XYZ file of C-alpha atoms in Angstrom:
25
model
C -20.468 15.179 -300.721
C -16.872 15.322 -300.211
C -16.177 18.529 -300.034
C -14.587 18.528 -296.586
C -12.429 15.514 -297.025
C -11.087 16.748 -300.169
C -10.596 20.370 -298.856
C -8.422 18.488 -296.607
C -6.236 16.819 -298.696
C -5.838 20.436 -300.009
C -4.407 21.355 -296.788
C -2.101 18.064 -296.577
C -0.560 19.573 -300.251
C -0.043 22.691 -298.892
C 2.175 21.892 -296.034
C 3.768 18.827 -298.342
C 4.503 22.353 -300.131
C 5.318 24.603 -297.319
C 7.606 21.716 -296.048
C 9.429 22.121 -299.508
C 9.798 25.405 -299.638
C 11.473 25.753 -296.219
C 13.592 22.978 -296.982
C 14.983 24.537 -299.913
C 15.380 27.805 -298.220
């Protein structure tokens, strides 16, 4: 499956969101 792989690309839109957030803050 591709569970893993996608649960990581998750994680990369997290910090592509965490990143914005500080940025704006």
């Amino acid at each position: 499956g591709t569970f893993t792989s996608d649960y990581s690309k998750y994680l990369d839109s997290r910090r592509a969101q965490d990143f914005x957030q500080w940025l704006m803050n």
